[PDB]
Amino acid sequence: DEYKKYYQQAIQLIQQLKKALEGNPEMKKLADKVLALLKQAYAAFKAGRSPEEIRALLRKAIEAAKKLAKLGASLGGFDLAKRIIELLKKMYELGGL
Hints:
- The protein is an all-alpha fold.
- The two termini are 12 Å apart.
- It contains four helices and no strands.
- α1 runs antiparallel to α4 (78-94).
- The protein is elongated, with a radius of gyration of 13 Å.
- The chain has one domain (2-94).
């Protein structure tokens, strides 16, 4: 189950990243947004939706994670955000099943 593996890995990285964002509200909001879209994408995947629907949710997640990583380049958290982006892109490729 490739999608599940990357999903669970991304969930743990997001939760770990959130721990380091206590006084950074914009980053916290973006991390919460990435988490919400990641869950919606996995729900669409489990429900048998179109590759387009799954990838739209993952694309929105990737764009939010890129904004998070840019903030993390200045304030900390970049390496975790960068790995989250890479995991989202791996799930994006699997959406075409």
